Amino acid sequence: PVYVDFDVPADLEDDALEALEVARDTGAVKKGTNETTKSIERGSAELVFVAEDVQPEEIVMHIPELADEKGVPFIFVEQQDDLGHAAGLEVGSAAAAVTDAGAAATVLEEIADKVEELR
């Protein structure tokens, strides 16, 4: 909420999650805020996911700006457990990062684009 500066349409989110699954079954994904963060910092991140129901928010506040000074695109997910589930986890996840997808390389390429337009 304080780290969220734009709202993502349910539909767009549903897409992104579907893409994250094929990216984890084809390409490569990072689960967890720390792994996601190092990813963004190392440049390997192509698309980072950030939940919106993270309490405390200190866990993620940094992502948005960090991602910006790295050109890394990012998208919000209304729920924490959905993102974790999508990342193939039996638990929730505050942040996930697609580190070079697969079979989704294109599908996500547009997602990054659609978001830009969404400010």
Partner 1 sequence: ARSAYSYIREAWKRPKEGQIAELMWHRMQEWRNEPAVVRIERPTRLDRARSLGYKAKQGIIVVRVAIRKGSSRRTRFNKGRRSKRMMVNRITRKKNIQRIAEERANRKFPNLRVLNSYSVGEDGRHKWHEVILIDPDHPAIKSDDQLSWISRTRHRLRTFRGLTSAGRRCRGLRGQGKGSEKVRPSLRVNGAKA
Q: Select from 38, 53, 89, 92 the one that contacts Sr ion (CB under 5 A).
A: 92
One residue of 17, 20, 31, 45 binding RNA per CB under 7 A: 31
Element (H, E) at 40: helix 33-42
CA-only gyration radius of the chain, Å: 12
85 near RNA, judged by CB under 7 A: no
**Neighbour count for residue 17 (Cβ, 10 Å):** 19
Residue 55 interacting entry, from partner 1, RNA, Sr ion, none, C-beta within 5 to 8 Å by type: partner 1
Phi, psi of 75 (to 5 degrees): -135, 145
| Minimum separation from the CB atom of position 55 to partner 1 (A) | 7
Give Cβ neighbours of residue 107 (< 8 Å, ≥ 6 apart): 15, 19, 22, 101
- Work out how close the CB of 60 gets to Sr ion at its nearest, in angstroms, rounded to a whole number: 15
CB-nearer residue toward partner 1: 19 or 49: 49
Interface residues with RNA (CB under 7 A)? 31-32, 34-35, 38
